[PDB]
Amino acid sequence: MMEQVCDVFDIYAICACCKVESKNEGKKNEVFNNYTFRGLGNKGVLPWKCNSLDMKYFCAVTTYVNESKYEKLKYKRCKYLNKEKKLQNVVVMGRTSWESIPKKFKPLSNRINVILSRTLKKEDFDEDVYIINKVEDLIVLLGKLNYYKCFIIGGSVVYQEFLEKKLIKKIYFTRINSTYECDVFFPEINENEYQIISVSDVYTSNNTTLDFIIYKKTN
Amino acid sequence: DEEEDDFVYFNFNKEKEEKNKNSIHPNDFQIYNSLKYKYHPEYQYLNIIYDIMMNGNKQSDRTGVGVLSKFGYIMKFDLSQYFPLLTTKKLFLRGIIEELLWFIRGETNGNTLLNKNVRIWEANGTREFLDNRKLFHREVNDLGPIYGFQWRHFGAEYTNMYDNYENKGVDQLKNIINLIKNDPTSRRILLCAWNVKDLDQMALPPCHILCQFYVFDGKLSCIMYQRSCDLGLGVPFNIASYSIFTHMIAQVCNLQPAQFIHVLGNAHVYNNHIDSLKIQLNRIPYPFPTLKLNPDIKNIEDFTISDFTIQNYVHHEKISMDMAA
Ligand SMILES: NC(=O)C1=CN([C@@H]2O[C@H](COP(=O)(O)OP(=O)(O)OC[C@H]3O[C@@H](n4cnc5c(N)ncnc54)[C@H](OP(=O)(O)O)[C@@H]3O)[C@@H](O)[C@H]2O)C=CC1
Ligand SMILES: O=c1ccn([C@H]2C[C@H](O)[C@@H](COP(=O)(O)O)O2)c(=O)[nH]1
Ligand SMILES: N=C(N)NC(=N)Nc1cc(C(F)(F)F)ccc1Cl
């Protein structure tokens, strides 16, 4: 059948959402649901400060590669596009997101960094990164690159547009079980387009419990 | 891949999925079975519910309701990582905390709990209940030599719920707190409520037989043995109850809580709870909340309701395990 772009190019999303300060629905008799966790950022940075464990998780997922699986992936993408070291993953982020990262981490290590922007061009960056002004360009770029998996580390605006177009094969979602002030949020996942298939162990880090759940695009 | 086939052979004696007992319908747990990885700790609880429905034995019981049952299960909860208050349904802890403080004081007076609007023991203290237990000379709500009495006065002769049992009987609690404090490697740190001699004098025998503690690297772990476990109504609270108890003991002994281990003996599911559990098993767990204890409390006896705070409890909606309307 008509293979989906997100499937051919293994394009996933990964994020961490905390609970929003919905003033006064806050005391009991409050209803909870998956959308309870939607707080992504505040003031161009993270609502909660930094979460060590969440970070360990982020780096672990976005840098992990399986060399023995590439050949299979190469063949897939080639056949798709009508064709015939150190494998790396690709991370795609919005410009705002790229700037909110401390210089010491830019560009994200052991990862092919791709930034989405209209106000900036390659001449405005000093780092080893790819710049693109259209989502369609990411696809062209992916078709030309050697990589394992592609991760949309987002920016709320980025997450939003990649979900509408159905470019996400799975969502690695981190539920920060605490509340902070926020100004940007993750889109409300439609229980019909995506369904949770895995829920991890629960942990404590930086004074808050959290877990990791994996959403998957339904058939 | 040669191992692959040997695995298949080694299962030559696992017969057909028809003699899998209790005619269970898959469709009732689609969401539950769809899940690939179920690592959230709440699944230790849910998985048992599933096992008991799918492989449980049909038995009758002291009540007549009829239950499905299995024997011998174990759950482990990491209190240094979270507070295990189930999320697939709503739970309140005010009651079980008042009950716990009530145990610690060695009380056996049900009125004390009822005056705090905690009815956990109300049914076990009525004239009828007491009389059916043959405790004709027992005043209404005088529960008898139960938990509290055994924890502070094991061995002492029970008179009534108003008596003063000071320096009478063995004060186990006091004893275990001393053992953890001064002899942390002791393999004799147990709290026992199953006083064989006083069983018939109790409103009813205790379900939580004993607790054993373990201390290592400044961390306290607890194992509690439950003889009779009501997966639908009881267990959720039992888990919470002892997790809180482990925190308290851990604190007054200058240690950090670690593992709370729950050993289930007769683990049963009341037939009249099945529909509600089906519903529940299809709900995905939310991350557990946390428990905060006033740190200034240094004595196990100085705790009060306001010294306990549960934070960030995200849970599905309330469920009556016995739905009618
Ligand atoms: N909790 C979490 O897991 C995460 C939180 N965050 C937080 O999110 C906030 C940032 O998110 P948000 O403000 O939504 O910003 P984004 O990171 O989504 O950046 C949006 C910007 O990226 C560019 N862009 C997006 N789509 C396109 C496109 N199709 N073509 C060209 N350029 C595009 C534009 O740059 P330009 O303006 O140059 O045109 C745009 O205005 C911060 O507070 C950050 O801390 C970020 C990542 C993860
Ligand atoms: O803390 C408690 C107290 C009671 N029960 C349940 C177990 C049984 O269903 C019933 C007691 O019946 P017997 O075991 O006494 O027969 O109460 C619990 O699960 N937890
Ligand atoms: N933390 C997550 N699971 N999500 C996430 N996308 N975060 C995240 C984190 C970082 C930083 F910590 F390295 F600065 C940078 C960019 C993103 Cl998109």
Please state, in angstroms and rounded to a whole number, the distance separating the CA atoms of residues B59 and B207.
Answer: 19
Q: Whose CA is nearest to atom 8 of ligand 3?
A: A153
- Regarding the beta carbon of A116 and ligand 3, being less than 6 Å apart is answered no
A175, A177, A178, A183: CA torsion to nearest 10: 20
Phi, psi of A136 (to 5 degrees): -55, -30
Report the amino acid identity of residue A199: V
CATH code: domain of residue B242: 3.30.572.10
Please state, in angstroms and rounded to a whole number, the distance separating the CA atoms of residues B309 and B97.
Answer: 11
Q: Which ligand is nearest to the CA of A173?
A: 3
Please state, in angstroms and rounded to a whole number, the distance separating the CA atoms of residues A213 and B244.
Answer: 27
Alpha carbon A48 to chain centroid, angstroms: 18
Residue B207 designated active-site = yes
Name B89's Cβ contacts closer than 8 Å, sequence gap at least 6.
Answer: B236, B280, B283, B315, B316, B317, B318, B319
The answer to whether B195 touches B154, Cβ cutoff 8 Å, is yes
- Mapping DSSP onto H, E and C, the string for B55-75 reads HCEEECCCCCCCEEEEEEEEE
Q: What angle do CA B322, B324, B325 make, to 5 degrees?
A: 145
The answer to whether B93 touches B310, Cβ cutoff 8 Å, is yes
b/e per residue B124-141 (b: at least 16 CB within 10 A): bbeeebbeebebeebeeb
Q: Return the structure tokens found at A12.
A: 């996933």
The answer to whether B85 touches B288, Cβ cutoff 8 Å, is yes
Please state, in angstroms and rounded to a whole number, the distance separating the CA atoms of residues A194 and A175.
Answer: 16
Q: Return the structure tokens found at B292.
A: 């905060």
Report the amino acid identity of residue B299: N
CB-count burial class (<10 Å; 0-12, 13-18, 19+) for B197: exposed
Q: Return the structure tokens found at B88.
A: 């697939």
Task: Write out the binding residues of B.
Answer: 62, 187-188, 207-208, 226-228, 230, 238, 268, 270
b/e per residue A190-200 (b: at least 16 CB within 10 A): eeeebbbbbbb
Could you count the other beta carbons within 10 Å of the beta carbon of residue B217?
A: 8
Cβ–Cβ of B289/A201 closer than 8 Å? no
Resolution (A): 2.7
Please state, in angstroms and rounded to a whole number, the distance separating the CA atoms of residues B228 and B206.
Answer: 9
Cis-peptide into B295, omega within 30 deg: no
Please state, in angstroms and rounded to a whole number, the distance separating the CA atoms of residues A219 and B34.
Answer: 13
The answer to whether B208 touches B226, Cβ cutoff 8 Å, is yes
Please state, in angstroms and rounded to a whole number, the distance separating the CA atoms of residues A150 and A10.
Answer: 6
The DSSP bridge pattern shows strands A11-20 and A203-204 to be: unpaired
Please state, in angstroms and rounded to a whole number, the distance separating the CA atoms of residues A12 and A8.
Answer: 11
Please state, in angstroms and rounded to a whole number, the distance separating the CA atoms of residues A107 and A101.
Answer: 9
Residue B52 C-beta-side C-alpha neighbours within 13 Å:
31
Please state, in angstroms and rounded to a whole number, the distance separating the CA atoms of residues B158 and B106.
Answer: 12
Q: Is A213 on the interface with B (CB under 8 A)?
A: yes
> Which residues of chain B are within 8 Å of residue A213 when distances are taken between CB atoms?
284
Please give the tally of structural domains in chain B. 1
Experiment used for this model: X-ray
- Mapping DSSP onto H, E and C, the string for chain A reads CCCCHHHHCCEEEEEEEEEECCCCCCCCCCCCCHHHEEEEEECCECCCCCCHHHHHHHHHHHHCCCHHHHHHHHHHHHHHHCCCCCCCEEEEEEHHHHHCCCHHHCCCCCEEEEEECCCCCHHHCCCCCEEECCHHHHHHHHHHCCCCCEEEEECHHHHHHHHHCCCCCEEEEEEEEEEECCCEECCCCCCCCEEEEEECCCEECCCCEEEEEEEEECC
- Mapping DSSP onto H, E and C, the string for B122-184 reads HHHHCHHHHHHCCCCCCCCCECCCCHHHHHHHECCCCCCCCCCCCCCCECHHHHHHHHHHHCC
The residue segments making up the domain with residue B99 are 1-325
Could you count the other beta carbons within 10 Å of the beta carbon of residue B174?
A: 12
Please state, in angstroms and rounded to a whole number, the distance separating the CA atoms of residues B275 and B320.
Answer: 10
Please state, in angstroms and rounded to a whole number, the distance separating the CA atoms of residues B184 and B173.
Answer: 15
Name A20's Cβ contacts closer than 8 Å, sequence gap at least 6.
Answer: A38, A39, A179, A182, A185
Give me the helix-helix angle, B234-252 and B172-182, nearest 10°: 50
Query: 């309307």: which residue's tokens?
Result: B325
Ligand 1 pocket by Cβ (under 6 Å): A 15-16, 40-41, 44-46, 93-97, 100, 116-120, 133-135, 153-158, 161, 184
Atom of ligand 1 nearest to the CA of A119: 38
Could you count the other beta carbons within 10 Å of the beta carbon of residue B36?
A: 11
To which CATH superfamily is domain A1-219 assigned?
A: Dihydrofolate Reductase, subunit A (3.40.430.10)
Please state, in angstroms and rounded to a whole number, the distance separating the CA atoms of residues B93 and B309.
Answer: 10
Could you count the other beta carbons within 10 Å of the beta carbon of residue A175?
A: 22
Tell me which residue of B284, B91, B279 sits closest to A189, measured CA to CA.
B284
Tell me which residue of B43, B65, B71 sits closest to B281, measured CA to CA.
B43
Q: Chain B: residue nearest A174 by CA?
A: B287
CB-count burial class (<10 Å; 0-12, 13-18, 19+) for A155: buried
Q: Chain A: residue nearest B282 by CA?
A: A196
| Annotated catalytic residue within B192, B207, B229, B253 | B207
Cβ–Cβ of B82/A203 closer than 8 Å? yes
Q: Is A197 on the interface with B (CB under 8 A)?
A: yes
The response to whether A45 counts as a known ligand-binding position is yes
b/e per residue B303-319 (b: at least 16 CB within 10 A): beeebbebebbbbbeeb
The answer to whether A209 touches A37, Cβ cutoff 8 Å, is no
The answer to whether A13 touches A163, Cβ cutoff 8 Å, is yes
User: Distance, in angstroms, between A202 CA and closest chain B CA?
Assistant: 6
Query: 């990262």: which residue's tokens?
Result: A101
- Mapping DSSP onto H, E and C, the string for chain B reads CCHHHHHHHCCCCCCCCCCCCCCCCHHHHHHHHHCCEECCCHHHHHHHHHHHHHHCEEECCCCCCCEEEEEEEEEEEECCCCCCCCCCCCCCCHHHHHHHHHHHCCCCEHHHHHCCCCCCCHHHHCHHHHHHCCCCCCCCCECCCCHHHHHHHECCCCCCCCCCCCCCCECHHHHHHHHHHHCCCCCCCEEECCCCCCHHHCCCCCCEEEEEEEEECCEEEEEEEEEEEECCCHHHHHHHHHHHHHHHHHHHCCCEEEEEEEEEEEEEEEHHHHHHHHHHHCCCCCCCCEEEECCCCCCCCCCCHHHEEEECCCCCCCCCCCCCC
Q: What angle do CA A171, A138, A111 make, to 5 degrees?
A: 65
Please state, in angstroms and rounded to a whole number, the distance separating the CA atoms of residues B150 and B202.
Answer: 11
Q: Is B134 left (phi over 0), alpha (psi -120 to 50) or beta?
A: left
What Å distances lie between residue B184 and B178, B216, B220, B226, B261, CA to CA? Answer: 9, 8, 9, 24, 18
Tell me which residue of A17, A22, A12 sits closest to A175, measured CA to CA.
A17
Q: Is A19 on the interface with B (CB under 8 A)?
A: yes
